[PDB]
Scaffold this active site. Sequence first.
Site: not given
Ligand code: NDP
Ligand code: WHF
Lengths: 249, 250, 252, 251
Positions: C13, C145, C158
């Site tokens: 991702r 975020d 979170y």
């Molecule tokens: N996706 C979105 O729409 C949004 C994303 N963000 C921020 O962007 C960043 C990336 O998002 P996204 O790609 O969706 O992230 P994900 O939720 O897909 O998580 C990314 C990786 O975090 C790792 N992870 C989870 N738990 C642990 C743990 N306990 N220890 C070590 N590693 C861990 C996992 O690795 P593994 O698979 O190797 O276990 C996972 O694949 C994040 O910080 C997210 O909060 C903010 C707002 C929205």
């Molecule tokens: N680690 C992650 N943090 N945010 C994630 C998904 C974001 C998401 O579904 C939404 C964030 C706000 C409205 S919808 S994965």
Amino acid sequence: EAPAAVVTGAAKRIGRAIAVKLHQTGYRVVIHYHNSAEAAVSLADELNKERSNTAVVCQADLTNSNVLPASCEEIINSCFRAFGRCDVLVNNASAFYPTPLVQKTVETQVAELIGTNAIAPFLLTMSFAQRQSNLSIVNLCDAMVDQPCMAFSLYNMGKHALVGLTQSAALELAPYGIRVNGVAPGVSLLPVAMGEEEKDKWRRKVPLGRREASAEQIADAVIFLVSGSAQYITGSIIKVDGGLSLVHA
Amino acid sequence: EAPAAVVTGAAKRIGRAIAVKLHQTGYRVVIHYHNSAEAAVSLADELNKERSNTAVVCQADLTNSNVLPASCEEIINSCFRAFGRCDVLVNNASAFYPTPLVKTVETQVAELIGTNAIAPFLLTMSFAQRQKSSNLSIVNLCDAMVDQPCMAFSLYNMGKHALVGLTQSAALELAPYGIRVNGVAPGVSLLPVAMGEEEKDKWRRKVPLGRREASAEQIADAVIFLVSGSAQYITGSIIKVDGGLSLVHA
Amino acid sequence: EAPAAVVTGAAKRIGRAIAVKLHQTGYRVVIHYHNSAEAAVSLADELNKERSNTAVVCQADLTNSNVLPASCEEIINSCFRAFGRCDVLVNNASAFYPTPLVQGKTVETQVAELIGTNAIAPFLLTMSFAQRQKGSNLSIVNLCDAMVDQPCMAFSLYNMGKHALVGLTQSAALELAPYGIRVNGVAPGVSLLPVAMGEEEKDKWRRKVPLGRREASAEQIADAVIFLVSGSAQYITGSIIKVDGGLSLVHA
Amino acid sequence: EAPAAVVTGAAKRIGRAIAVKLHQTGYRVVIHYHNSAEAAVSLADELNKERSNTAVVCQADLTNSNVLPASCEEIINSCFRAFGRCDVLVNNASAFYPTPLVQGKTVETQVAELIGTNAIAPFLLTMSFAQRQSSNLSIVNLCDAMVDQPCMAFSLYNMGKHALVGLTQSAALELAPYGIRVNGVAPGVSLLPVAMGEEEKDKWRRKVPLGRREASAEQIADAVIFLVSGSAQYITGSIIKVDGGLSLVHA
Ligand SMILES: NC(=O)C1=CN([C@@H]2O[C@H](COP(=O)(O)OP(=O)(O)OC[C@H]3O[C@@H](n4cnc5c(N)ncnc54)[C@H](OP(=O)(O)O)[C@@H]3O)[C@@H](O)[C@H]2O)C=CC1
Ligand SMILES: Nc1nnc(CCC(=O)c2cccs2)s1
Ligand SMILES: NC(=O)C1=CN([C@@H]2O[C@H](COP(=O)(O)OP(=O)(O)OC[C@H]3O[C@@H](n4cnc5c(N)ncnc54)[C@H](OP(=O)(O)O)[C@@H]3O)[C@@H](O)[C@H]2O)C=CC1
Ligand SMILES: NC(=O)C1=CN([C@@H]2O[C@H](COP(=O)(O)OP(=O)(O)OC[C@H]3O[C@@H](n4cnc5c(N)ncnc54)[C@H](OP(=O)(O)O)[C@@H]3O)[C@@H](O)[C@H]2O)C=CC1
Ligand SMILES: NC(=O)C1=CN([C@@H]2O[C@H](COP(=O)(O)OP(=O)(O)OC[C@H]3O[C@@H](n4cnc5c(N)ncnc54)[C@H](OP(=O)(O)O)[C@@H]3O)[C@@H](O)[C@H]2O)C=CC1
Ligand SMILES: Nc1nnc(CCC(=O)c2cccs2)s1
Ligand SMILES: Nc1nnc(CCC(=O)c2cccs2)s1
Ligand SMILES: Nc1nnc(CCC(=O)c2cccs2)s1
């Protein structure tokens, strides 16, 4: 065919670095100016020397008044007249001087500070959008806007309104594919009329390098926001302040 | 003896409840108005029936123009002429209507930026210039939704951002004179006069706290706190009174 | 030599896109993973195929515990061991799930995962990253975020972690500036939606976005990271760039 | 019947001032304390000699641990045990000390105390407060007006106060339907640490635009009392700075 940008207040300092950098990226440019006629004309020559027919100058007072809308429409119209398109607007022109609450007419200070920093950007944005790829607006904001200079009420109000415009126009123009963002310097090129000791006093406060931003470093942020690397970015304001706004009193 | 307050746009709605609340607290009041003469006078008569000679009215257009500084100086002067002092200023008057990007635009700018921002700056200047156990303060009526604005209200939203700027800038500048400057920021309070109940309800349903808009009196309560002795160390603060509305995502 | 970057949670991702784009820019990369070993190695395989010995993997749980400091020191050491330097740290790994206030993990486990990954690990990694240069374009990028002030219902912990991360971004920008280490943030709104999420709920969010009625791609998030680490951002520290298509600007 | 309030870290300083002013307003109070046993018992004594059976003390460490949830649950249970109700929770207790990023207690301990007291304990107390629930229920979190202009080398403390802003907003949103309001009070400089010498105190005093002096503990309590009152019944998710313009001053 190369895209085109309007940069207001582009004859000198930050606006010039922005116009030069846009031109280096392949943009054709309208160099707007108010008083600095000779510098604007000289800049247009330099840029036209590098690639012919890529730069024109455009004179306009951006003080608030009943004719300001016409002046702003003309700035945008001049981009179409020269280049047949207008892809980018950079709102850079700005009056900056103290307006103490307790003691130029106050009428004039309001017109200049709110006009250049807030109302002209609004009207330019309106004319930009009305006359309409990768279209975007960049507004020059202020990273110190919540920690303002003492006795700069009107200026601070203008920059605060500029934040409002950035967000309001981002929301409204999104369905037209027009992105609207801001770049917010802390201390960059310090004012000519500022004494060298005060300059060094500000320089010492910057955590990252105890120095001000070059005009080029501000321009770099503008270049990013107008580029294809920022296609999903709108309503965002990027501080380029070396950490200055993070420092307590 | 009794302190005195100026409330702009005080004939109706939120401004009126603020004026009534300040008067009940012991303030004498200048009820400023623009078009609502009958309502301003009616409020004044009601308040004067409670305590004689404690309310006056003052008419002025707060649209930006060449005469605006003189009008704002006069509004403040009226408080001194009526009461001999001016302890509190409440910047409440506000124009509010859409100004889409895509009545002339120069008049929209004059009205929206004038009422919401320039008039408050001019009134602050005049208020402070005249003061150059006293608790002097200014309350600016801001907007809790300023960073999540109504679609096509750029000019209004610009005015309200500017007002946040003034609040902070004036708080900093006027602190040496012991003048505090604060804000109250409603989300949804008294909804437009003729707005359909089905439309009112759409907004009411968005408010986490009670699924209802704020009464003018609840907005007024926050103004009362900020002018009071319980807020003597509070300056440059903007209190949201929005029932959690600004916290709700799209 | 080439600069070297650590990306946490880089197997899939958004982290994958960041690691890829950093690799395409000329960085050598440490691909950190927790459970996604197969994915991390197959990314390293693809990157090493382009340029030999420019990608390594590093396993660690980033949950808050007595051993977290040691694990974070080792993530950073993996970069110095492999590549001889560490120029960039991208704090991307994140746990994300609801923690209602009013009612099979225990609450203390939810705290350890949500606060550990989103905030504590970033802090410890920042600490180790800085100490290993305590005795030239150093920066940290924190994945924040954009919706942090308009949080998802019942996501208290979170949301606490992402707020803490803003604080870290600013505190570390201030403290590390004399060392020439810049600290910034990228804040997605809606990017790649979680696998768990139902398709109708995905379209719900897509429709709310002013700029194009779609989510950010992972690559668009990575673009802002690339900018922040580049020489074009040499004066930028303590800044958090939203990459949200205007979503945070939309009222209820 | 009189309403009841829990105040954490209430034995001294700002928490005491809050407990005193809530008591003067007519609340029965649970004076939470960690180490200051003597000062806690003494406050409870003063308050009870003003009105009988209106104050109790409650000991608890608010350091993060696997037992912290039960500890926080018990603090809330103690209010119901003493007074039969819990109307107000004030999250005041706070550890405060530097954690430099570049070089005592272990780092694990620093995380547990700074994040635990400032953020995790407030979260669990909020959970238990809500779970245990005419009525005017609310929570007030003691935040920091300088949260975005932080003290150098105070990362963990700053992360905790940031997280507390997040909780204030998250809980406001989630508990609104239950009629529970959640707000914050953000001092700038109030009662300076007892360890701080007079010279450094004055340095901080000089920076405040309003009066060149710190906030009194009572001035902080005033804003708490407003937020719990019926004059704030529409206010939730709001954080009131009580900082005399301090946060507005540039470097
Ligand atoms: N996706 C979105 O729409 C949004 C994303 N963000 C921020 O962007 C960043 C990336 O998002 P996204 O790609 O969706 O992230 P994900 O939720 O897909 O998580 C990314 C990786 O975090 C790792 N992870 C989870 N738990 C642990 C743990 N306990 N220890 C070590 N590693 C861990 C996992 O690795 P593994 O698979 O190797 O276990 C996972 O694949 C994040 O910080 C997210 O909060 C903010 C707002 C929205
Ligand atoms: N680690 C992650 N943090 N945010 C994630 C998904 C974001 C998401 O579904 C939404 C964030 C706000 C409205 S919808 S994965
Ligand atoms: N310099 C710094 O450290 C900081 C800058 N900024 C912002 O960045 C932007 C650029 O900064 P900087 O280069 O210093 O800007 P300047 O103060 O140098 O102003 C730039 C141009 O604004 C134009 N201008 C002034 N008044 C008017 C008017 N009435 N009508 C039309 N144009 C007018 C002038 O053009 P002319 O010479 O042709 O008359 C001037 O050259 C501004 O928006 C500024 O507010 C924000 C924080 C700090
Ligand atoms: N009501 C709400 O839900 C919200 C209110 N607010 C803010 O709270 C404050 C009070 O709100 P509300 O009661 O709805 O305000 P209104 O929209 O009812 O306007 C208040 C008064 O402003 C005065 N006014 C308008 N234009 C002018 C002018 N050109 N010159 C002088 N006075 C003028 C009018 O006085 P007159 O009638 O005498 O002509 C009007 O009665 C305002 O600042 C508003 O922006 C913010 C968010 C939401
Ligand atoms: N004072 C100021 O200038 C400022 C204060 N604030 C905030 O306002 C609030 C009150 O400030 P102040 O009175 O100075 O606070 P203090 O620093 O005096 O701390 C208050 C109480 O916190 C309790 N505490 C510390 N660690 C623990 C622990 N591990 N478990 C349980 N309790 C603990 C202590 O209780 P005990 O003595 O019983 O052991 C202490 O008496 C705090 O949240 C503070 O962060 C914000 C900005 C400035
Ligand atoms: N138009 C302009 N806006 N800001 C300018 C210079 C900014 C400046 O001198 C300082 C900014 C912060 C501390 S000093 S010119
Ligand atoms: N001057 C005024 N400002 N705001 C007013 C009414 C506010 C209003 O109708 C709404 C604001 C946000 C959703 S509905 S009048
Ligand atoms: N728990 C505590 N939090 N903050 C405290 C004192 C804060 C303090 O001394 C200063 C804060 C900003 C400049 S000095 S104790």
